[PDB]
Design a protein around this ligand. Sequence first.
Ligand SMILES: [Mg+2]
Ligand SMILES: [Mg+2]
Ligand SMILES: [Zn+2]
Ligand SMILES: [Zn+2]
Ligand SMILES: [Zn+2]
Length: 142
Amino acid sequence: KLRRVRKSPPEGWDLIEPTLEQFEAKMREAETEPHEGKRKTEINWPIFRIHHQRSRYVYDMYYKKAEISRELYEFCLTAKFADAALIAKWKKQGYENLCCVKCVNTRDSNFGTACICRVPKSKLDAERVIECVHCGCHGCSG
RNA sequence: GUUCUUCCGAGAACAUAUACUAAAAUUGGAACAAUACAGAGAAGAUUAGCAUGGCCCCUGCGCAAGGAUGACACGCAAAUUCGUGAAGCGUUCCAAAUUUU
Ligand SMILES: [Mg+2]
Ligand SMILES: [Mg+2]
Ligand SMILES: [Zn+2]
Ligand SMILES: [Zn+2]
Ligand SMILES: [Zn+2]
């Protein structure tokens, strides 16, 4: 992924790189672990869950923790360590805990509705447990 | 759940209904390979073909071209209706040459 950006990592990179290298180690496993004993949906869910974390790490480091500047943060987006289309949601009021992108999309559903996991999951029902088909998210609004 | 309110443990905004919903459990439909056995249209025989028909297909992009001319067609071939004069009958047969005590 560093060959894709030609310029070298800016100054902060030593801090994030040990973590970012572990997310790649996870993702190579999740790409390759056997597709048997799991539902046809479940096998995809590790990909989205690791992708969500990795973007959330880069996002938390700059926005919550300020431990990377702008130039390294924007470097991470350009390298594609971070899902920056998704991060654009987390900035939004009311989406700050979002799972993937596909659950907000609406247009890919049958009835033109966002996914179920959004549904202020407090409001939804007294006891209903949920694992939405796109990414197994249990409820990402609170 | 996260950002704001404060009298303080509550309130306000944002956010709003995914999924042939299965890691299954049941239950069907096609084509294969080939034992021993004989022969695939055209008034004797050897044989191109092109058509015709439809609850029959196959190869083909196909209104081309192929598959035995792809196969089948292959007889009791019976569909609107009569008109004539003879004869049994009506219940019934069949017979003494001559001649002597
Ligand atoms: Mg002949
Ligand atoms: Mg032929
Ligand atoms: Zn979600
Ligand atoms: Zn999702
Ligand atoms: Zn969802």
